[PDB]
């Protein structure tokens, strides 16, 4: 006998994100297997953990063309009590725009966990110096003073045999998740600032080249997590 059925009001609706299969039209097809091919990607956070280059403007004020964005910050000999480079911890900011962490995360609504900033000193081996790397919680005014950076979460990095320092930005958030994109620039989307201060000047023996450069990488920590995939930005194709 015919089974009595009550079709719901949402019948014949196509739903793009429906978690169910549809009818097969061309079954009994065996594809070539894939034993030989290595490098299988189970999860996109495996590529988020890979460090990639950030971007900054090269030098103020005159530049031949504004497109001259550069993956390093040059260290001048001149001393003034302001950071050499600073950027907000906000994953929609241009400093993350061409990193894998920013590009992957920008297609997700929320993130959780730590961002890992990696620095690389590309100057000569004879160079000696010290840098203070400081992460500031959100505040009414961004800190600029080295004394103000010293009051925040900070680590001192020494130039020596090992050329690199991995700075893990701590996850300090009022909510369990944070917004990837700062629409209203609220506390849930902008998590303060990271800043670089020189502690001592870089010292050089004579005939060394002046102004060495620190190469910047951005990467996801091992606790980093992404949630709620959203529509992409198609701006890259135009």
């Amino acid at each position: 006998g015919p089974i009595p059925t009550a079709p719901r009001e949402n019948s014949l609706m196509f739903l793009s994100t429906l978690p169910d299969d549809t009818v097969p039209a061309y079954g009994n097809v065996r594809t070539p297997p894939v034993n030989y091919l290595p490098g299988e990607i189970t999860d996109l956070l495996q590529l988020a953990r890979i460090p990639t280059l950030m971007a900054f403007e090269r030098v103020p004020e005159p530049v031949p063309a504004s497109d001259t964005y550069v993956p390093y910050v040059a260290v001048p000999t001149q001393f003034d009590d302001r950071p050499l480079i600073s950027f907000p911890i906000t994953l929609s900011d241009p400093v993350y725009q061409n990193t894998l962490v920013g590009a992957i995360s920008s297609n997700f609504a929320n993130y959780r966990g730590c961002i890992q900033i990696t620095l690389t000193f590309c100057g000569p081996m004879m160079a000696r110096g010290k840098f203070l790397l400081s992460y500031s919680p959100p505040n009414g005014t961004q800190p600029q003073t080295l004394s103000e950076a010293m009051q925040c979460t900070y680590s001192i990095w020494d130039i020596g045999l090992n050329s690199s320092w991995t700075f893990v930005v701590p996850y300090i958030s009022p909510s369990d998740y944070r917004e990837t994109r700062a629409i209203t620039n609220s506390v849930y989307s902008a998590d303060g600032w990271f800043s670089l201060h020189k502690l001592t000047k870089i010292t050089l023996p004579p005939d060394c080249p002046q102004s060495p450069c620190i190469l910047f990488f951005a990467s996801a920590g091992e606790d980093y997590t992404l949630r709620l995939p959203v529509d992409c930005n198609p701006s890259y194709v135009f």
Partner: protein, 258 residues
């Protein structure tokens, strides 16, 4: 902590590495490849056949070619032009000129997160009419196959051969929708997201793969050639990747700073 980035390996650190703290607990798994790509998105918009088509010629197409552009849809994330696979994506910025405006397509959502070199999945295809209450049908033929471009006569009505065949035909109801899933049908093991080889030994184009597709679909009215009016009708194509797997980690597209 101290490292050497010149190693090529960097250990994913935590808050407790240098400072006092602990791991943030995991709470999501949406970056999984099988979960992420398993959602439908707009592939292409094709015109509806009302007669037996003449399939678009291979490039370079010359003047006076009698062919039906805009009716066939390659099931590719890769860029296409004039229902044939392309390397560069192209668009038209200005109306003025003379000549045929070629159809081009992309899956912007795919390349926004590929991020890998090789891809393989089954493909759910969903076909939605852009015209209200349209009665239409979907014809598919696999990778390596071709369109049967002729008609047969029944009661002095020309009936095209694409109404039949061994490959799947799906008739929608009046105002209905078509949905079905397709297997990986290529001679190749996987689809190359980016490719450096050449398909032929002579006169081929570098970076243009021949069979990086799940076949070609087209929309047609289930009525003979004598029933025709001038009003062109349009059909949108939706694709969804089933059991998606990825290999060989790679780059994401450049984002302009202007």
């Amino acid at each position: 902590s101290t490292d050497n980035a010149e190693t090529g390996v960097i250990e994913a650190g935590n808050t407790d590495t240098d400072f006092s703290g602990e791991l943030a607990a995991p709470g999501s798994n949406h970056t999984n490849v099988k979960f992420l790509f398993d959602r439908s998105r707009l592939l292409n918009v094709i015109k509806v056949l009302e007669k037996d088509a003449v399939f678009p010629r291979p490039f370079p197409t010359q003047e006076g070619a009698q062919q039906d552009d805009g009716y066939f849809c390659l099931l590719t994330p890769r860029p296409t032009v004039a229902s044939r696979p392309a390397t560069r994506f192209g668009l038209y910025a200005n109306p003025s000129g003379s000549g045929v405006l070629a159809n081009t397509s992309l899956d912007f959502n795919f390349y926004s997160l590929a991020c890998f070199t090789y891809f393989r999945s089954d493909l759910e295809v969903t076909v939605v009419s852009l015209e209200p209450d349209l009665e239409f049908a979907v014809g598919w033929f696999p990778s390596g196959s071709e369109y049967q471009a002729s008609s047969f006569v029944y009661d002095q009505l020309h009936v095209p051969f694409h109404f039949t065949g061994r490959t799947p035909r799906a008739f929608a109801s009046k105002g209905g929708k078509v949905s079905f899933v397709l297997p990986w049908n290529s001679v190749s093991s996987v689809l190359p997201v980016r490719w450096g080889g050449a398909s032929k030994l002579s006169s081929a184009t570098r970076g243009l793969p021949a069979h990086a597709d799940w076949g070609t679909i087209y929309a047609f009215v289930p009525r003979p050639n004598e029933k025709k009016s001038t009003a062109v009708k349009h059909v949108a194509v939706y694709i969804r990747y089933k059991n998606a797997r990825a290999w060989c980690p790679s780059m994401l597209p450049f984002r302009s700073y202007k």
